From a paper:
Furthermore, cvACE2 also efficiently mediated Omicron BA.1 pseudovirus entry, but weakly mediated the prototype SARS-CoV-2 pseudovirus entry. For cvACE2, seven substitutions were observed: Q24 (human)/L24 (palm-civet), D30/E30, K31/T31, H34/Y34, E37/Q37, D38/E38 and M82/T82. Q24 of hACE2 formed an H-bond with N487 of the RBD, whereas L24 of cvACE2 did not. No significant change was observed between D30 of cvACE2 and E30 of cvACE2, whereas T31 of cvACE2 formed an H-bond with R493. H34 of hACE2 formed an H-bond with Y453 of the RBD, whereas Y34 of cvACE2 formed two H-bonds with S494 of the RBD. In contrast, the hydrophilic T82 of cvACE2 may sabotage the hydrophobic patch comprising F28, L79, and Y83 of cvACE2 and F486 of the RBD, whereas M82 of hACE2 may participate in the hydrophobic patch. D38/E38 displayed a different H-bond network, where D38 of hACE2 interacts with Y449 and R498, whereas E38 of cvACE2 formed H-bonds with Y449, S494, R498, and Y501 of the RBD. Similarly, R498 also promoted RBD binding to cvACE2, where the longer side chain of cvACE2 E38 formed an additional H-bond with R498. However, when the prototype RBD or omicron RBD binds to cvACE2, the small side chain of T31 could neither bind to E484 nor A484 in the RBD. E484A, Q493R, and N501Y could facilitate cvACE2 binding.
The Omicron variant of SARS-CoV-2 carries multiple unusual mutations, particularly in the receptor-binding domain (RBD) of the spike (S) protein. There are 15 amino acid (AA) substitutions in the receptor binding domain (RBD) of the S protein, nine of which are located at the binding interface of the SARS-CoV-2 RBD and human ACE2 (hACE2) receptor, namely K417N, G446S, S477N, E484A, Q493R, G496S, Q498R, N501Y, and Y505H. Receptor binding is the key step for SARS-CoV-2 infection. Omicron BA.1 was found to display a broader host range than the prototype, whereas the Delta variant showed no alteration.
Numbering used by the authors:
A (entry chain B): 333 to 527
B (entry chain A): 19 to 614
Write the structure that this text describes.
Amino acid sequence: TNLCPFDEVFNATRFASVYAWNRKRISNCVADYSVLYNLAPFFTFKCYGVSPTKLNDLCFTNVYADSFVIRGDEVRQIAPGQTGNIADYNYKLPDDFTGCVIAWNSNKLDSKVSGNYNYLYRLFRKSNLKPFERDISTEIYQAGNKPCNGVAGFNCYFPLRSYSFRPTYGVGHQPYRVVVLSFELLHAPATVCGP
Amino acid sequence: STTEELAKTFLETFNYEAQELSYQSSVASWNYNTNITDENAKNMNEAGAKWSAYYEEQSKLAQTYPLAEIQDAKIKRQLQALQQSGSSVLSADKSQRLNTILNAMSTIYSTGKACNPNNPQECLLLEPGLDNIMENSKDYNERLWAWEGWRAEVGKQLRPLYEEYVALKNEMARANNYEDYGDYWRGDYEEEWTGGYNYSRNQLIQDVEDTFEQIKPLYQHLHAYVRAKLMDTYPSRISRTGCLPAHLLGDMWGRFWTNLYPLTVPFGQKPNIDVTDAMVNQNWDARRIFKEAEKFFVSVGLPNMTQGFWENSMLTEPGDGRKVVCHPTAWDLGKGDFRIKMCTKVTMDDFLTAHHEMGHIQYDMAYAAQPFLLRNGANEGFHEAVGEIMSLSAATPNHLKTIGLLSPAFSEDNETEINFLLKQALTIVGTLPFTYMLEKWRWMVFKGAIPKEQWMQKWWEMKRNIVGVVEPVPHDETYCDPASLFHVANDYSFIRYYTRTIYQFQFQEALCQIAKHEGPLHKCDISNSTEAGKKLLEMLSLGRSEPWTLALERVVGAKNMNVTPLLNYFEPLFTWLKEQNRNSFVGWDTDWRPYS
Ligand SMILES: *[C@@H]1O[C@H](CO)[C@@H](O[C@@H]2O[C@H](CO)[C@@H](O)[C@H](O[C@H]3O[C@H](CO)[C@@H](O)[C@H](O)[C@@H]3O)[C@H]2NC(C)=O)[C@H](O)[C@H]1NC(C)=O
Ligand SMILES: *[C@@H]1O[C@H](CO)[C@@H](O)[C@H](O)[C@H]1NC(C)=O
Ligand SMILES: *[C@@H]1O[C@H](CO)[C@@H](O)[C@H](O)[C@H]1NC(C)=O
Ligand SMILES: *[C@@H]1O[C@H](CO)[C@@H](O)[C@H](O)[C@H]1NC(C)=O
Ligand SMILES: *[C@@H]1O[C@H](CO)[C@@H](O)[C@H](O)[C@H]1NC(C)=O
Ligand SMILES: [Zn+2]
């Protein structure tokens, strides 16, 4: 009766920035989705390819939990075939994505009157991300034809930006913690069921 | 890379820090206006300075992306806003002098005062002293004191400054490729778009004149009616064929004849509709006032106020020691933060104000998806017209009855209908010739068409000819009576109120025809008309992203200022004036003066 480490991911005190989104491999445990309680206001639970309605009786080889924080406007982008600064440059899900995307408003946790600059997102990237790619590069974005010399300048911008969360922000700019449960099926033992 | 793609990315990095600093300012600016402390005053000016600093820097960086190579309007209109230099085109000599003059005129206006000839120790500041005199005194001489005293003890002090202000503003405009400072102000309405949605700066001149030439019939019969109902009081002081004395018009300048209503109400017996008593009798509070306004917009398909609106706004005077200048404000701070700063009292006028101010929020919320520099009214008059039609709909007996304020008693009569429209006309119709004439004067002043040794002489010639208003005291060139009005002294364009007034009735009429409204336009409540709300959102959500000529068309179906909706709003009063002026002189001889 080995309980899966979901309390680690959802209930963590600090979430990763979306650009440097954190993945937590989950294996050899009973997956208790049943207690993935409705955490916070504006709760969002979206599943693709498989049904969350108590279809725990399925087993999966490995189950990856990808967590990060984005603003409410960008939760729609954590879905197959979506475009935007997050889906293009920060976190991309495949077209054939089989999993679930969970999202709750975390304004009470991740905002600050002075602005929480801890959460970042990639604003610039010469290419969009292949599915589940992570880009933590901090190389200056060379918008221009002149080389940037690794320092911010004209036509040379830092690729990341801060969300600068303030509790007063509108719902569209408030922080939303997101956890993406990718379910993997290989010709493999399939060690994660959970009754 | 291309000078457009480079522009986009630059605007991306600008739109990030701007939206950051603009928020920081708006909050720090909100925290002062709701806490008024010298400490929060520093933070407000500091965040305002970091914001101004960034904008000034980015303006310079932006000019390096030539607009001639931009095709995307979302980039062009964004770049155009940032690229405009302003006073930063003058030498630091001229700029430091221009600021010195501007801050001087603003200080001379506020700190200035006029003293009684009877009581030379009663040096009364305009706000609130001389304003109480102009707005309430029925005494000819007490009104004559303040009017002449203000235009002398303040208006003369501004005369040398305004002469310099016109010169230093011209040099700023000409160096920014504008004919004069007036053509610079008219550039707000300039749209260089395709599809016949273009608009020239000079087209505003013709348009404002041509539309005024149709307000003239309304104004004359309002004038002859005001002149007659005025002539009852001040009897020997107002000629039956002459112009109106300027000090007898309500406001210190005659901007709003709103306060002539006690002396001009058609059927004074029939009481005004005041649901203020009905609100107290139902234990209404400020939150209820705004919840009803929220329900109003929701009825017409607009979103409710955000949660951050209810838990951040100041809908009541805070109290304690927390001073807050009680004046309605609608805050688009940014990052989805929408707030209203209002010392709401449970009255009808604050109820109507709450809808008006919440209209601003609906406009601010609608275009929040627009790029930051485009998050604004389609032009300077759009944002105010959207607010005004919110009080127009909410003030009708229909809306008051459906919300339980005015009892289910189907009130109204052919007399109270005339009373309200007369009250409206004093405010809305009365200001238009005042606004056109004042701004026409500045345009000719800036154009150079009026020599300085004839400024006042040409001003009062225009006042008599166009506004039908004459000075009680002759004024030589030591006066600068226009400068005795706030916007003139404080360097604010004024054709906004003219244009906004025309717009709001174009707005209201278009929405009311959408609303299947049967009957007079002034009785129209757009409530529950989700078809009208959609055409509104189609324009509201545009912001400044598209020309006002086109944005106006997404509501009213015309590319320009049409005054006929305004006339149709007052046709009931127009016909009733033509009869109550049948035996009266409609017009004015410009040579009559109360000083012989
Ligand atoms: C209205 O404004 C005043 C001052 O502008 C606010 O007073 C500040 O209140 C906060 C929280 O109550 C205090 O932390 C703050 O004191 C800080 O600053 C001083 C130096 O100024 C510092 O030495 C302290 O250690 C502390 O960090 C108060 N500052 C002042 C100057 O009074 C007040 O909260 C505001 N209230 C509202 C309702 O807006
Ligand atoms: C987080 O903690 C609460 C309180 O104990 C619990 O109900 C919830 O299941 C926890 N979340 C996860 C993912 O375990
Ligand atoms: C620009 O608009 C004006 C009216 O605003 C119109 O008269 C003029 O024809 C337009 N420009 C051109 C080149 O036609
Ligand atoms: C907000 O407006 C919607 C739209 O009609 C309405 O259904 C909803 O009830 C409103 N909000 C609340 C809290 O009632
Ligand atoms: C609008 O709808 C409400 C109920 O939704 C109704 O009571 C009211 O009479 C309608 N009309 C107006 C003008 O409010
Ligand atoms: Zn307003």
